[PDB]
Amino acid sequence: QSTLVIAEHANDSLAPITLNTITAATRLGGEVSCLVAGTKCDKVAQDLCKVAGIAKVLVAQHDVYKGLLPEELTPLILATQKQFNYTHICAGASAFGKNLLPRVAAKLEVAPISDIIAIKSPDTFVRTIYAGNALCTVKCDEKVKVFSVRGTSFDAAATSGGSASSEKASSTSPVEISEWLDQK
Amino acid sequence: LGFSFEFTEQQKEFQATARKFAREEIIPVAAEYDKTGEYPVPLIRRAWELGLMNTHIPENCGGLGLGTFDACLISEELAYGCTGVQTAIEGNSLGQMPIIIAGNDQQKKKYLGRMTEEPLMCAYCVTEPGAGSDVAGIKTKAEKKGDEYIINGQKMWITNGGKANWYFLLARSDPDPKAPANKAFTGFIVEADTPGIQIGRKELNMGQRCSDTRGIVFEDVKVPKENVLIGDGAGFKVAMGAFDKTRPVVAAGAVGLAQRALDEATKYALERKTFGKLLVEHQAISFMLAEMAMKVELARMSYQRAAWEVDSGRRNTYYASIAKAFAGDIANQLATDAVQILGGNGFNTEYPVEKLMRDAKIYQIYEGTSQIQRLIVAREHIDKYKN
Amino acid sequence: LGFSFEFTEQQKEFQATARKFAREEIIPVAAEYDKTGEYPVPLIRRAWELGLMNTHIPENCGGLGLGTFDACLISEELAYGCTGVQTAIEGNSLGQMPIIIAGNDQQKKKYLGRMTEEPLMCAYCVTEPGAGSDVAGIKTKAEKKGDEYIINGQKMWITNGGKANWYFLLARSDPDPKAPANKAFTGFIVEADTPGIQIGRKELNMGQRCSDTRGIVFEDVKVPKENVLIGDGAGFKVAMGAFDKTRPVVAAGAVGLAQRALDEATKYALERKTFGKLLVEHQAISFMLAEMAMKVELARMSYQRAAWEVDSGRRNTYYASIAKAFAGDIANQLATDAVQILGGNGFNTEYPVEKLMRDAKIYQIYEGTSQIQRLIVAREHIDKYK
Amino acid sequence: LGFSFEFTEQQKEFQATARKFAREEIIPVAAEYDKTGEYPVPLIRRAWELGLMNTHIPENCGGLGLGTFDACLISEELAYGCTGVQTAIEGNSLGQMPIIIAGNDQQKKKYLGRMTEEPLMCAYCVTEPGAGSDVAGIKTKAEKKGDEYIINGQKMWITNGGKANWYFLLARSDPDPKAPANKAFTGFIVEADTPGIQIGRKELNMGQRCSDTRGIVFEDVKVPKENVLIGDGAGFKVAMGAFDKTRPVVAAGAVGLAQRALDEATKYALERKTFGKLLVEHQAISFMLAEMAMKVELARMSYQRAAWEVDSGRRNTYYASIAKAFAGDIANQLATDAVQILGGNGFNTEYPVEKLMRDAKIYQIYEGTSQIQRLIVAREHIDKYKN
Amino acid sequence: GLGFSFEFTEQQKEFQATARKFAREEIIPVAAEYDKTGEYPVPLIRRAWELGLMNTHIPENCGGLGLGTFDACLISEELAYGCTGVQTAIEGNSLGQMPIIIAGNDQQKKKYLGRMTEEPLMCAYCVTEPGAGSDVAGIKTKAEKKGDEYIINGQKMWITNGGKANWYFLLARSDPDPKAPANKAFTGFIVEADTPGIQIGRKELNMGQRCSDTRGIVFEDVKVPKENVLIGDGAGFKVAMGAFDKTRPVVAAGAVGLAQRALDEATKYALERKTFGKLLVEHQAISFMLAEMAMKVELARMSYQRAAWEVDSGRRNTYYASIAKAFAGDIANQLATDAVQILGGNGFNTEYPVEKLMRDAKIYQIYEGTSQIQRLIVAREHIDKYKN
Amino acid sequence: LRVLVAVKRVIDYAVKIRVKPDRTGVVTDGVKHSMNPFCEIAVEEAVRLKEKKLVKEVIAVSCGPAQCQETIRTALAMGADRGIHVEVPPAEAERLGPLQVARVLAKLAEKEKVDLVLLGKQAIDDDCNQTGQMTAGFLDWPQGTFASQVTLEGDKLKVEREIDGGLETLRLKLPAVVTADLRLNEPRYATLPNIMKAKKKKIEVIKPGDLGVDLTSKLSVISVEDPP
Ligand SMILES: Cc1cc2nc3c(=O)[nH]c(=O)nc-3n(C[C@H](O)[C@H](O)[C@H](O)COP(=O)(O)OP(=O)(O)OC[C@H]3O[C@@H](n4cnc5c(N)ncnc54)[C@H](O)[C@@H]3O)c2cc1C
Ligand SMILES: Nc1ncnc2c1ncn2[C@@H]1O[C@H](COP(=O)(O)O)[C@@H](O)[C@H]1O
């Protein structure tokens, strides 16, 4: 059983919430693949490589991944899923994270799992529910686990000691049904 | 002078007599007397032997010539034992009092003397089927026909009424409807055996079941003018006058009852457990026993105060009614709670609180209702403020 | 939908039957029954004939299949008449509750059915000389023995205990003293003719003198495993559960007696005169009467509410406990006030009101005392907060 | 056909809106408005915008034509916020009620119509410096000058009395003091700008400080004939027939104040520890919260009943007066208790409970005192048993 | 003994006419103003001091009158009939004094009692904290011994005269060990109010008694010398606990004082107001109220009297004081609301004197022990009579 | 433009929540429920656009028991024109989630011929924040999630949305899905007049079988507890 991590990033700067994701990733006990999508990817790909836990870094560089739009990225992640067949696809339960995965799930026709804080095993998870006033434990029996991961619930993985291969990701056709316009 | 809430050595000993008496002689038979309703003559009689009865009768008749404070303090101890028996005892004082305050050396020596030599009983006779609270509305007729007056009418609820040597009786003597109470009534001493006096059945009451309560009919009954109180038409003042030195002793009675309730409830709360703690470690129970103790303590001072005002020759009405009203209510309040603290057992005949509840109710009712005690308190109070 | 305070046309028939029975048949003899304290067998049989008894029994078993709101109309009417009588009647339906809510069809047809064919009685045996309020405190042990259970212990204060065909019995199953209520008790149906059951003497109480209350002892009593209620150790939940459907009916008794007291007292103050006026024209008397009318109305709406709550499928623990507490206390306040309005007459056994004072005290003791009732309300109430 | 205690879905939405507004807009500023005694204009205008005011105004007059049961449920929700403000807005229904029950199409469109269009206030003018509970002892003379009427005299304690467009005003129409009360008074609609009206300064009261309450002098006020309620002398029927549909609303306010007491005391008793435990784990405090919950619960059914009786076109004088008596009393009881539970804090001006004690007292005085509520319930009660 | 007696010593009638004269001629005309503004009522306090009716428990050998508890109550009731804002400012004095009286030595008694004799100085009782009031043993103010001194770090809350005091009696936690029983974890101090570490807080705004000042005060690093501990270390709790015997009966006497006022105002009013043809007092409902009110005051009076006599006599009066405090407080409230009531709409008004009484009365159920706490103490005391 | 607004009946936030002994879920019996506060925000947005006259009609959908009548009715009172209840008995309600619902809402979207589905960003009960995304997923339309500002531009939406550092700004082609976030707007009250007027407006009750949707969930709650 293999796992895939959508790395969140920005301006050549791995987003911290990804390191936590990668700790959570290794808990599952399977080769951890991490996917870097964007318009200048190579720098982060290089930091991601150094990181412990990571067997393979896949890179998808392309101008169209301006603002990491979920309509662009979803078929990219889907394309990777076909060539490789992961049991797990996770991302840091951040605004980027929460926006992307439930769509990916729809596209896979599996039901995702949000904001998890522990990992009881490769198919059992623990989130909060009702402004966290209860603790929910969910068994997922899908062909694919899709889920996002609460940052503060896992330690940041060592940024050094990684022996990861960096490979070209499989490519997808620019959708252009959405477009990035601006920030703050 | 200055305040003192301390008894005389003489008082401390009267009290010890009556405690000993009520605790060893009354308590162990009361339930038995209450179950049957038999009038407790051994007891009345033992009370007399001990000087705990007819206490208000002066020395010049062989009486103890004691104060209202003394009668009160005795009465609490007896009522603790049983208010059925103490109401039969006190009965005697209610009847004697109008003779004590308003009759003449002749009248006292004949009718009080006798009580001093044999344990006789006498009674107060005023209430009638149609009036109790409204004394001005009594209809028993009393007209002069010679050197004597003839009596027609009916009394109801007379304590000792069927056990009495004599009666203090009050009849309307003035036919004129428009005649004031101040003038319209005469008070009589009346020997029980007279022709024309027919005593009715023992009345069966909720509580104080061994006290003797009956109705009395007066059919053409003749009493000598020698037996008139201060004079014709001055009856209302005589009867009203008595209430000063009797009302506090009724309130001590209730306090006696109240105290019993408290002790039974406290003794029990100290041996029954539920949910692992003693009753008494349930704060709601502590708080009940706490409010109960308060009520007893305050009601005691209430009567003590009215007793002292009079013993010192002041008029009393206000303090006495406060005490009567207050001690009355608290007896009742204390009795449900004492029943309540014993729970299902409290409800049952084999425990002593059930009786206390039944007994405690007359205190709101006789010797002046809870309602009319409030009328009296109000009018006495409103006077302090009027020009 | 909308709020509504009108009985159903059918309910009004029950109420009419019940008022007619209580007024034409209970009132005329109740004074006597209190005096002699004997079990009112004929009025019971008649209550039974007339449909006013075992009312919770399902159509399935030949019962009338009625709700707690229905049971409550009737008991108010019966209690107005006499709570002695009305107690003896409800005791049956309290006996029945644990079987109605937690029997299987064998037990229901067997022990409910018979009550349909014949005016039999049953009782609820939970209390013990040692524990009443504290139910987890009961010390009657029941030991298993193959296909049947041996009950050893002693129950106290049983309504109709002594006139019953069978009993609901709660007993301490688990002998290890560390085990929680939730698993330490089994509830049984126990046939009364059973050997080992010694019914004690008639207990002599302040009030409700004609109700049959007594203690019963259980010596090696044998109870078949078919008579266990849901299973070993489910005794608590069973008993506990009965209370939702019954507590409102004790409340309605309290309201019945209350109503009577107000009736007696009002009737009287419209005819006695003092100081030239009818009692009613003294403002202190009127204010009492007002306050009394006030409490009965409030008290009746509290049971009504409770009864509808359970009848509409939800738990009513909070409201039932309110109804009990409030009705119980105002029962006692009204009775003492009625005696008070009637003066010396009031203190006298030849008038109807002193009996009310002695009856009403029970309403603050059985089926959960005033204090236990507040515990329940507080716990219910607080729990809507954290 | 069955008791029900579930609202209509329409009524739950009403409640949710009334509760949203009260929790979110009234509460956050209620203490300011209480400190400063300024009239809550921004809030009235909001509630008016929301459709929460003048709920009784019939459809054909531009209003919602809603029942008494609906006003009650709205107004409970608002009282919970502040009875100061709940009272300012209720007083509009109180002034409007005589018109709604007893006024001709011209009158209802004229004077109720405005209220639909701008958010104006009106007020019920009845009390005077020298009669309040004795409506019949009202002495503000009104005299005919063919054409119109001339009002002379003086009103006291008028809610909205200085912020009103118009008045329902009740005056002695008939000089003969032997005249029966049911024919002696005429009730008028009276535009507030009318020359001769002198409104007084704000009355500085203990509680509901942000309510406008003030006295008014009338001097030679000219009121037009078409503004008379039913006809000359009819006033007393009119004035009295209003309380039917208002009294349950007032009660519903007392219960508002009461939940709030209950809620604040419970929150606090869940955080504060003494002696190692939370307040809720001392039985005495539980038992308190218990008795508060019960009194809240029953106060609520009592007004719900009253409101339903009148919505079935029955008159509800018994029921309303039970609710107003009971709600009044328990609101007072719950207030001190909330203040007691919060200890030192409770008594301080920065915690919310102390206001509630000051506000609650009015509920035993306005719209009929605890005393006269009891006279009504006694009147209605006795009549059931007489011939 | 001699009989029971309910008659004052001529000397006490003498003290009564004075306190009653002041209360009636000086307090009453101004009390509504001081309640409106909260101004601390300096002219009256000075005048009370002057008139000899303040610091009355101070023993003669410190230059006071060494008056008894009965005498203090006697006076309290009179000042409280006038105003309990005022009466409370006067009392606060006794309350800070009492532990110096019962537990100080001659050098303390004379330096600190002595000074109140020669100027109308104020002192305070400093115990209650934000987090503990009723549960005294719950207080957290620290006292660490450091040389011949104590350093105090803590916050205090609801302190009467807290902002006007020449000095404070202070209870603090001496010993850090949580598990240390109350009879050993606290120390009692005299702390002069102007010591460097002390920061008075603002005037605290309450519903009632709005003219005494009550304030929180913080002690940051406060220096307090050895010579100012009360019996020694770990004695603090008994020392505070023992002041109440001599003072609970006076606060109850306070309640009784406002109670009587309420009755008086309500009675005068019902005597002059008419409705439906007659004066209020001719309606039975009112009459009966006036009657029950009359009862409650009377009984509440005997109750505090009783308590002050027991101690004057030299017994421990815990039981009697606590009935007095419970019952007096409860009836003061009851009577205040009923006074408002009897006055109708007028009662709810600011120009009539009754709403104030209603606001003032609530505190008697809270401070100097709450109703619950009173009830705990009594049940405790009752239940012991029944054990061996 | 026609708009579809999703509304979810949730345990009213004020109710302080209690967990079941049997630890299977939380206590949902006799427990006040209103419209999820983010749905409130979305319903508001349907209406402000309908106010700016850029929308000719607003439909309101809800999925669960019948008590979602209550929920749809509130929406109707705020400005929604007709309502759709998708019916699922309080048995199958338990195991229903964002997947089911998006499936539902998508079939619904194409059927009623809509140009915008408005949802709130997350339900305060299950905290999923999944439905909107998933629904955009099934329709293959673009999604402006966590909208904090919205604007129609002919056939393009301009969505300002709320991202970790500040705001991001998108242009989407116009069948679009938008999920509302707190800062979007301040939702209006149901006015007593409109709560009355809303009784008149009708709610078509249909079932998921009808729409063409299967409810089976290879997800599964194992347990629910209290917190640490
Ligand atoms: C204006 C006024 C003046 C004051 N002046 C002084 C002063 O100068 N010096 C000083 O030291 N303090 C003073 N105080 C403090 C006052 O003594 C306390 O507020 C009170 O004694 C206990 O108050 P608390 O607020 O801590 O009550 P809490 O301890 O917060 O208790 C709150 C409620 O819980 C009840 N309760 C607490 N424990 C129990 C229990 N075990 N069982 C049952 N019920 C319980 C209480 O009776 C009360 O109803 C003053 C207070 C007031 C506000
Ligand atoms: N059962 C449901 N019925 C209708 N709409 C829903 C439902 N569940 C979720 N939604 C929509 O999806 C949003 C959040 O779903 P979730 O991802 O579960 O928080 C809500 O604001 C709704 O607008």
The label of the residue with tokens 């421990």 reads E316
Tokens of D291: 């008795």
Chains that touch C (3 or more CB pairs under 8 A): B, D, E, F
Q: What technique was this entry resolved by? A: X-ray
Q: Is the same domain home to C63 and C150?
A: no
Burial (Cβ within 10 Å: 0-12, 13-18, ≥19) of residue D137: middle
Query: What one-character-per-residue DSSP string does C319-366 give?
Result: HHHHHHHHHHHHHHHHHHHHHHHHHHHHHBTTSSHHHHHHHHGGGGTT
Please state whether C375 falls in left (phi above 0), alpha (psi between -120 and 50) or beta.
alpha
> In sequence order, what are the residues at sequence separation of 6 or more whose Cβ sits closer than 8 angstroms to the Cβ of residue B110?
none
CATH (domain of F67): 3.40.50.620
> In sequence order, what are the residues at sequence separation of 6 or more whose Cβ sits closer than 8 angstroms to the Cβ of residue C149?
C142, C143, C186, C188, C222, C223, C224, C225, C228
Please tell me the number of the ligand nearest to residue F179's CA. Answer: 2
Q: Is the same domain home to E229 and E268?
A: no
F38 Cβ under 8 Å from any chain A Cβ: no
Q: Is the same domain home to C263 and C218?
A: no
Q: Give the separation between CA B291 and CA B275, rounded to whole angstroms.
A: 23
Domain boundary at D226, D242, D258, which? D242
Chains that touch A (3 or more CB pairs under 8 A): F
Q: Give the separation between CA D96 and CA E303, rounded to whole angstroms.
A: 53
Contact yes or no for E299 and B301 at CB 8 A: yes
> Would you say C147 and C224 are in contact if contact means Cβ atoms under 8 Å apart?
yes
Which letter does DSSP use for residue F36 in this model?
-
CATH (domain of D365): 1.20.140.10
Find, among E81, E127, E76, the residue nearest to E308 by Cα.
E76
Q: Give the separation between CA C326 and CA C374, rounded to whole angstroms.
A: 10
Q: Is the same domain home to D330 and D252?
A: yes
Mutate to test the pocket of ligand 1, among E93, E134, E156, E322 (most ligand atoms within 8 A of CB): E134
C220, amino acid identity: D
Task: Check contact F-E (3+ Cβ pairs < 8 Å).
Answer: no
C88 lies in which domain range? Answer: 3-121
Residue nearest to atom 9 of ligand 1 (CA): E159
> Would you say B338 and B261 are in contact if contact means Cβ atoms under 8 Å apart?
yes
Q: Give the separation between CA E252 and CA E367, rounded to whole angstroms.
A: 11
Q: Give the separation between CA E167 and CA C318, rounded to whole angstroms.
A: 53
If you measure from the C-alpha of residue E31 to the centroid of ligand 1, how many angstroms do you get, rounded to a whole number?
26
Interface of B with C in 114-173 (CB under 8 A): 127, 131-134, 136-137, 156-157
Find, among E84, E79, E90, the residue nearest to E42 by Cα.
E90
> Would you say B190 and B103 are in contact if contact means Cβ atoms under 8 Å apart?
no
Q: Is the same domain home to E53 and E137?
A: no
Q: Point out the residues of E that are catalytic.
A: 368
Q: Give the separation between CA E3 and CA B304, rounded to whole angstroms.
A: 11
Task: Check contact B-C (3+ Cβ pairs < 8 Å).
Answer: yes
Find, among E161, E246, E155, the residue nearest to E209 by Cα.
E161
CA E193, chain centre distance (Å):
20
> Would you say C52 and C90 are in contact if contact means Cβ atoms under 8 Å apart?
no
Q: Is the same domain home to E166 and E91?
A: no
Q: Please provide the distance, in angstroms rounded to a whole number, between the alpha carbons at the two ends of chain F.
A: 48
Q: Please provide the distance, in angstroms rounded to a whole number, between the alpha carbons at the two ends of chain D.
A: 31
B287: closest CA of chain D, how far (Å):
8
β-strands F156-162, F143-149: how paired?
A: antiparallel
Strands (E), B192-326: 197-202, 213-224, 273-274, 277-278
Tokens of E263: 């009755």
Cα-Cα-Cα-Cα dihedral sign, residues C272, C275, C278, C281: negative
C-alpha pair distances (Å), F176 with each of F49, F53, F154, F213: 14, 18, 13, 22
Q: Give the separation between CA A15 and CA E276, rounded to whole angstroms.
A: 84
Q: Is the same domain home to E259 and E289?
A: yes
Q: Give the separation between CA C105 and CA C108, rounded to whole angstroms.
A: 5
Q: Give the separation between CA C251 and CA C370, rounded to whole angstroms.
A: 12
> Would you say E259 and E266 are in contact if contact means Cβ atoms under 8 Å apart?
no
| Ligand 2, pocket residues at CB < 6 Å | F 6-8, 36, 38-39, 42, 61-64, 98, 101, 119-120, 122-123, 126, 128-132
> Would you say E220 and E153 are in contact if contact means Cβ atoms under 8 Å apart?
yes
C-alpha pair distances (Å), C20 with each of B315, C15, C32, C42, C68: 57, 8, 19, 16, 21
E288 Cβ under 8 Å from any chain D Cβ: no
* Interface-testing mutation among D365, D366, D373, D374, with chain E (most E C-beta atoms within 10 A): D365
Q: Give the separation between CA E331 and CA E354, rounded to whole angstroms.
A: 15
> Would you say C208 and C157 are in contact if contact means Cβ atoms under 8 Å apart?
no
Q: Give the separation between CA C271 and CA C291, rounded to whole angstroms.
A: 20
C-alpha pair distances (Å), B376 with each of B326, B330, E161: 13, 19, 44
Q: Is the same domain home to C128 and C86?
A: no
Q: How many other C-beta atoms lie within 10 A of the C-beta of residue F227?
A: 9
Q: How many other C-beta atoms lie within 10 A of the C-beta of residue B183?
A: 14
Residue ranges of alpha helices (H) inside chain D are 9-21, 27-36, 41-50, 68-79, 83-102, 105-107, 113-117, 181-184, 235-271, 283-311, 317-341, 343-347, 353-360, 370-383
Q: Is the same domain home to B236 and B258?
A: no
Q: Give the separation between CA B228 and CA D383, rounded to whole angstroms.
A: 48
Tokens of F52: 């700016």
Q: Give the separation between CA F55 and CA F2, rounded to whole angstroms.
A: 6
* Phi–psi pair at B217, nearest 5 degrees: -105, 130
* Phi–psi pair at B346, nearest 5 degrees: -55, -30
Q: What is the dihedral of CA F137, F142, F145, F151, to 10 degrees?
A: -150
Q: Give the separation between CA F11 and CA F71, rounded to whole angstroms.
A: 12
Q: Is the same domain home to C343 and C230?
A: no
Q: Which residues pair with C277 in a beta bridge?
A: C274
CATH (domain of D177): 2.40.110.10
Cα-Cα-Cα-Cα dihedral sign, residues F152, F153, F155, F156: negative
Rg (CA), chain D: 21
* Interface-testing mutation among F33, F125, F133, F161, with chain A (most A C-beta atoms within 10 A): F133
Q: Give the separation between CA D236 and CA D233, rounded to whole angstroms.
A: 7
Q: Give the separation between CA B371 and CA E287, rounded to whole angstroms.
A: 11
C-alpha pair distances (Å), C331 with each of B226, C31, C255, C362: 53, 19, 7, 10
Query: What one-character-per-residue DSSP string does F71-110 give?
Result: HHHHHHHHT--EEEEEE--TTTTTT--HHHHHHHHHHHHH
A124: closest CA of chain F, how far (Å):
9
E288: closest CA of chain C, how far (Å):
8
Ligand 1 atom having least distance to the Cα of E88 = 3
Q: Give the separation between CA E224 and CA B307, rounded to whole angstroms.
A: 55
E261: closest CA of chain B, how far (Å):
13
Residue ranges of alpha helices (H) inside D272-316 are 283-311
Beta carbon pairs, B and C, within 8 Å = 108
Long-range contacts of D179-182 (CB under 8 A, 24+ apart): D181/D135, D181/D136, D181/D236, D182/D236, D182/D237
D90 part of the active site: no
What fold characterizes domain A1-184? Rossmann fold (3.40.50)
Q: Give the separation between CA D136 and CA D171, rounded to whole angstroms.
A: 10
Residue ranges of alpha helices (H) inside chain F are 37-51, 68-78, 98-111, 131-138, 192-200, 208-211
Tokens of F192: 């007593």
Cα-Cα-Cα-Cα dihedral sign, residues B174, B177, B182, B185: positive
Tokens of F227: 């917190």
D176 Cβ under 8 Å from any chain E Cβ: no
B196 Cβ under 8 Å from any chain C Cβ: no
Task: Check contact F-D (3+ Cβ pairs < 8 Å).
Answer: yes
Which letter does DSSP use for residue B1 in this model?
-
Q: How many other C-beta atoms lie within 10 A of the C-beta of residue D270?
A: 14
**Which residue among A69, A94, A129 sits closest to F127, beta carbon to beta carbon?**
A129
Q: Give the separation between CA C158 and CA C211, rounded to whole angstroms.
A: 10
* Helix C353-360 × helix C317-347 angle, to 10°: 140
If you measure from the C-alpha of residue F121 to the centroid of ligand 2, how many angstroms do you get, rounded to a whole number?
8
Tokens of E216: 């929180």
Q: How many other C-beta atoms lie within 10 A of the C-beta of residue A123?
A: 18
C-alpha pair distances (Å), F161 with each of A15, A72, A98, F121, F168: 19, 17, 13, 11, 6
E72, amino acid identity: A
Q: Give the separation between CA E162 and CA C189, rounded to whole angstroms.
A: 70
> Would you say C27 and C355 are in contact if contact means Cβ atoms under 8 Å apart?
no
Q: Give the separation between CA F124 and CA F78, rounded to whole angstroms.
A: 21
Q: Which residues pair with D154 in a beta bridge?
A: D217
Tokens of E35: 């309640």
HEC readout, C62-120 = CCCCCCHHHHHHHHHHHHHHCHHHHHHHHHHHHHHHHHHHHCCHHHHHHHHHHHHHCCC
| Ligand 1, pocket residues at CB < 6 Å | D 272, 274-275, 279, 282, 284-285, 340-341, 343-345, 347; E 125, 127-128, 133-135, 158-160, 206, 214, 363, 366-367, 370, 372-373
> Would you say D361 and D333 are in contact if contact means Cβ atoms under 8 Å apart?
no
Q: Give the separation between CA B142 and CA B187, rounded to whole angstroms.
A: 9
Burial (Cβ within 10 Å: 0-12, 13-18, ≥19) of residue E178: exposed
Chains that touch D (3 or more CB pairs under 8 A): B, C, E, F
> Would you say F159 and F150 are in contact if contact means Cβ atoms under 8 Å apart?
yes
> Would you say E356 and D330 are in contact if contact means Cβ atoms under 8 Å apart?
no
CB half-sphere exposure, E64, CA atoms < 13 A: 26
* Phi–psi pair at E276, nearest 5 degrees: 45, 45
β-strands F9-11, A88-92: how paired?
A: unpaired
Please tell me the number of the ligand nearest to residue E161's CA. Answer: 1
Please state whether E342 falls in left (phi above 0), alpha (psi between -120 and 50) or beta.
alpha
Find, among C229, C228, C227, C200, the residue nearest to C214 by Cα.
C200
Domain boundary at D121, D151, D178, which? D121
The domain tally of chain C equals: 3
Find, among B199, C131, A132, D347, the residue nearest to F125 by Cα.
A132
* Helix C235-269 × helix C353-360 angle, to 10°: 160
Please state whether E352 falls in left (phi above 0), alpha (psi between -120 and 50) or beta.
beta
Q: Is the same domain home to E191 and E311?
A: no
Which of helix, strand or coil describes residue E311?
A: helix
> Would you say E312 and E240 are in contact if contact means Cβ atoms under 8 Å apart?
no
CATH (domain of C33): 1.10.540.10
D204 Cβ under 8 Å from any chain E Cβ: yes
Q: Please provide the distance, in angstroms rounded to a whole number, between the alpha carbons at the two ends of chain C.
A: 32
Q: Is the same domain home to B375 and B265?
A: yes
CB half-sphere exposure, C370, CA atoms < 13 A: 25
Helix (H) or strand (E) holding A7: none
Find, among C268, C172, C256, the residue nearest to C208 by Cα.
C256
Which letter does DSSP use for residue B195 in this model?
T
- Within 8 A of D274 by CB-CB distance, chain B residues are none
Q: Give the separation between CA E373 and CA E371, rounded to whole angstroms.
A: 5
Tokens of B343: 């729970």
Helix (H) or strand (E) holding C259: helix C235-269
Helix (H) or strand (E) holding D233: none
Helix (H) or strand (E) holding D364: none
Q: How many other C-beta atoms lie within 10 A of the C-beta of residue C283?
A: 20
Domain boundary at B121, B154, B185, which? B121
Q: Which residues pair with B191 in a beta bridge?
A: B166
Q: Give the separation between CA C198 and CA C217, rounded to whole angstroms.
A: 5
Tokens of D155: 């009103």
Known binding residue C344? Answer is: yes
The label of the residue with tokens 């939380």 reads F26
Q: Point out the residues of C that are catalytic.
A: 367
